[PDB]
Structure 1
């Protein structure tokens, strides 16, 4: 006849119990991440559920090598976390989508619903990349559906990273890739943002589609490009010599935004120590220098900007202030009950505390 659900759920529960304690059920392989942590797993289960692991295990058994697999070697184009791998392996074992622990897929804004904020998008990106590398089509489709449902609410700067990973996944994520391309074309993303966030192929494709649809594709000023290249090389004296000609201004070139977004901390610091640019100036996307400083999560940049008269009460076109951006850019792990817990870099927490201080000031 058809399917018997009771036996299927019993099988799923037994295999999930196997995954929960793999050492009590004769685990014979280990998957080591790029950080240093490792997860124990069994060769048969993952050789059956995924073709990638079957091929990798058949290749590893040919050298007569307890088998360890470096995740940083097989999947090389995206640094995946630990909880994403745990979720993917839980689905591999029990056919059940295990939810992530609180904090990983959640930001530091208690007002944020954690649906479209950056930590959740990053977790979904990691899980989708893992499902693509492991060649699990159901997980691929499910998480592509998730990102397609949420992408209309995520900010454009994160949609750029979503488009990047969608192109990384090739033809397996056609829907998400085309949707992100359409969203980026319809929006007013700077050419510098596209150049520094996307490979040359994507930039050329988006520019061709923008010029084909008759959209606004303005060229870059040559002298402004010279100032940008001078800033990218950390040559402040070159910026001084370029400004001596008075052909360009740091406000019309958004040199502060560029230095805060992409350049080094010391380069932006030395550029600010000259005082030849409006600190509260905006950009074609509507962000001020403090907003980009919040997006970068560098405490010294925010501090030096506040010591220069940066107004922190100004909002973006979407209604987000610098504190909101800083909270929604950091995950909740870095701001909760003060345990050790990997720690990562407490730079985002420092930025959040700086901006919360400036709030009540």
Structure 2
């Protein structure tokens, strides 16, 4: 094969992508936020069969709404730029620094949440666009990375693997194995994963010999009472002396999945240990840092939350809040607000 001619072809089409208006661009992919990427119909009709069928149906002044043809996973703009650059020039283009990097200067950005999110979005784009080489490349990257990612992000990775159909069998199997190997509570799974997925996971946990404890009836009642805003039902359930907020991890549940005011009320009741540790091994401060809600963090610190405690992996709430926030937010600014609150409190 003649490598030089192919390299010149790739360079010419990369220069085409780098200045689409200069080379007679005839289509525009609009994202969910409002940004636009100008692309040519011939290139994407050739490389992507999905784009061929979509442009053939739209042609029955050409715009494609990405929020409609995807409609299963919100994808950023830099991931779209990477996918289109690979479609045009057959080479992967790294995103601008900050999109696939977290706000922790000690993090290598191999397994932190921004990098995982970018990889997930690009893989979903490659699946929707029907590009098998990019799908395999990023499936291998995610398989090499899931072992070092926090389990709460492994949940989202497994969600994407389930959405991406049979094109990610290896990723789906690895994620199911990692989840059933750990001691993840059923609550989160049922409130995040779909019904058939949680049922399959529970069936595999039962048949594989691994222990699957029965969901405590009163704990389930407390959780259902917490999901439905009704503080009087919570008082009625607590007046029976048959329940304990620490034994049910009600603070963790309210901070992770419930509304801000519900957690604030449960904290003002002063009926649960703030520094209590859940079966997973996390404190309420770590869950608050993951949730990224400033009111909960302020109410926790104002109630006596100890910030020097570390998790099983040795991360304190500050490192979790750093690894959970995007780097561009410290150069939605709700993450930056939490980061600055935690930095200001750490200074005292």
Same fold (TM over 0.5): yes
2:29 partner SS: strand
Q: Give the alignment partner of residue 35 of structure 1, picking from 33, 40, 43.
A: 33
1:40 partner SS: strand
The structural deviation recorded for 1:229 is: 0.8
The structural deviation recorded for 1:116 is: 0.2
1:257-276 Cα offsets, whole Å, 9 max, x none, are 00000001111111111110
CA contact (8 A) 1:312 1:358 kept: no
Number of the residue aligned with 1:191? 186
Partner Cα separation in structure 2 for residue 26 and residue 238 of structure 1: 65
The structural deviation recorded for 1:132 is: 0.2
Partner Cα separation in structure 2 for residue 161 and residue 228 of structure 1: 22
Q: Give the alignment partner of residue 55 of structure 1, picking from 53, 56, 59.
A: 53
1:30 partner SS: strand
Partner Cα separation in structure 2 for residue 182 and residue 198 of structure 1: 15
1:270-315 Cα offsets, whole Å, 9 max, x none, are 1111110001111110011111100010111101111100011111
The structural deviation recorded for 1:163 is: 0.4
Provide runs of 4+ in structure 1 moved above 3 Å: none
1:121 partner SS: helix
Residue 323 of structure 2 corresponds to residue 320 of structure 1: no
Number of the residue aligned with 1:92? 87
Partner Cα separation in structure 1 for residue 143 and residue 39 of structure 2: 32
Partner Cα separation in structure 2 for residue 61 and residue 96 of structure 1: 29
Number of the residue aligned with 1:23? 21
The structural deviation recorded for 1:80 is: 0.3
The structural deviation recorded for 1:221 is: 1.1
1:93-120 Cα offsets, whole Å, 9 max, x none, are 0001000111100000000000000000
The structural deviation recorded for 1:213 is: 1.3
Partner Cα separation in structure 1 for residue 199 and residue 114 of structure 2: 29
1:151 partner SS: helix
Return 138-147 or 348-357, whichever deviates more: 348-357
Partner Cα separation in structure 1 for residue 190 and residue 97 of structure 2: 34
The structural deviation recorded for 1:359 is: 2.2
The structural deviation recorded for 1:358 is: 2.5
2:148 partner SS: coil
1:209-251 Cα offsets, whole Å, 9 max, x none, are 1111111211111111111111111212211111011110100
Partner Cα separation in structure 2 for residue 238 and residue 16 of structure 1: 62
1:242 partner SS: helix
Partner Cα separation in structure 1 for residue 67 and residue 217 of structure 2: 40
CA contact (8 A) 1:294 1:325 kept: yes
Partner Cα separation in structure 2 for residue 145 and residue 73 of structure 1: 28
Is there any run of 5+ residues in structure 2 with no aligned partner, and where? none
Partner Cα separation in structure 1 for residue 107 and residue 234 of structure 2: 40
CA contact (8 A) 1:312 1:322 kept: yes
2:10 partner SS: helix
CA contact (8 A) 1:30 1:41 kept: yes
The structural deviation recorded for 1:152 is: 0.7
Return 107-116 or 235-244, whichever deviates more: 235-244
Q: What is the number of equivalent residue pairs in this alignment? A: 348
1:246 partner SS: coil
1:27-65 Cα offsets, whole Å, 9 max, x none, are 101101111111111111100000000000111111xxx
Return 350-359 or 226-235, whichever deviates more: 350-359
CA contact (8 A) 1:290 1:310 kept: yes
Is there any run of 5+ residues in structure 1 with no aligned partner, and where? 338-345
Number of the residue aligned with 1:179? 174
TM-score (norm: length of structure 1):
0.95
2:286 partner SS: helix
Partner Cα separation in structure 2 for residue 161 and residue 351 of structure 1: 22
1:170-211 Cα offsets, whole Å, 9 max, x none, are 100000000000000100101011112211111111111111
2:172 partner SS: helix
Return 113-122 or 269-278, whichever deviates more: 269-278
CA contact (8 A) 1:144 1:173 kept: yes
CA contact (8 A) 1:84 1:100 kept: yes
Quote the RMSD (CA, aligned, Å).
1.1
